[PDB]
Amino acid sequence: MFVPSYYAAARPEQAAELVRSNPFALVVSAVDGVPVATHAPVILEGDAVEGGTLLGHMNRANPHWRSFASSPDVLVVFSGPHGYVSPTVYATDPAVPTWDYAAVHATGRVELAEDALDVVERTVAALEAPRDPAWTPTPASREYFRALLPGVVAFRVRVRTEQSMFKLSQDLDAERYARVREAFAADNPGLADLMDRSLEH
């Protein structure tokens, strides 16, 4: 990822806010020099992505984690709202399309997590906390968790570098910007809100 100045994060907290809001991540590593990716829920431990620690888990029958000793460098991609910008919206002639999106790339070294149970239980707490009502695992479900544990592999990423893209049409003049925002306000309200958050002082 390359981040133009106009699409940099405005506030430092924005990257961590994106990570916490979009936990279903892509875990990417080099298995024998070839990239391999797994879609998995990953949560953030700490106030900031960079220097922070990510926790996740995957299927033990998924062979991706078997590379985590040999190929410890990993990339985790967190994806926020995104949407196509059609020149139809701009209402200008000569025009070119683009795609607006927010994403955070966290690169660090991966390691296997011994306490898999803690990882998945904290993942439950994090995803249920914003829902109403929240699901609280019963004692029977916690017993079920223990029984499922041989089938999971938990892992930790110590994040060395964090890269954040907030490509939200910030470079546009007011007329073309208003039209992009209005078009997303109807189709893609989550993107519209991110646009609004990107202009804050």
The single residue among 5, 96, 200, 201 that binds a copy of itself, judged by CB under 8 A, is: 96
User: Which of 5, 6, 70 is closest to 32 using CA atoms?
Assistant: 70
Residue 89 binds to ligand HEM (criterion: CB under 6 A): no
DSSP 70-124: T--EEEEEEEEEEEEE-HHHHT-SS---EEEEEEEEEEEEEEE-S-HHHHHHHHH
**Residue 7 binds which of ligand HEM, a copy of itself, none (CB < 5-8 A, kind-dependent):** none
Chain residues 139-168 in contact with a copy of itself, contact rule CB under 8 A: 140-141, 143-145, 148, 165
Residues 6+ apart with CB under 8 A from 168: 7, 100, 102, 191, 194, 195, 198
* Nearest-angstrom CA–CA distance, 80 and 173: 24
The verdict on 83 binding ligand HEM (CB under 6 A) reads no
- Residue 63 near ligand HEM by CB under 6 A: no
Rule CB under 6 A: choose which of 32, 94, 99, 132 binds ligand HEM: 99
| CB 2, min distance to ligand HEM, A | 5
Does 117 help bind a copy of itself (rule: CB under 8 A)? no
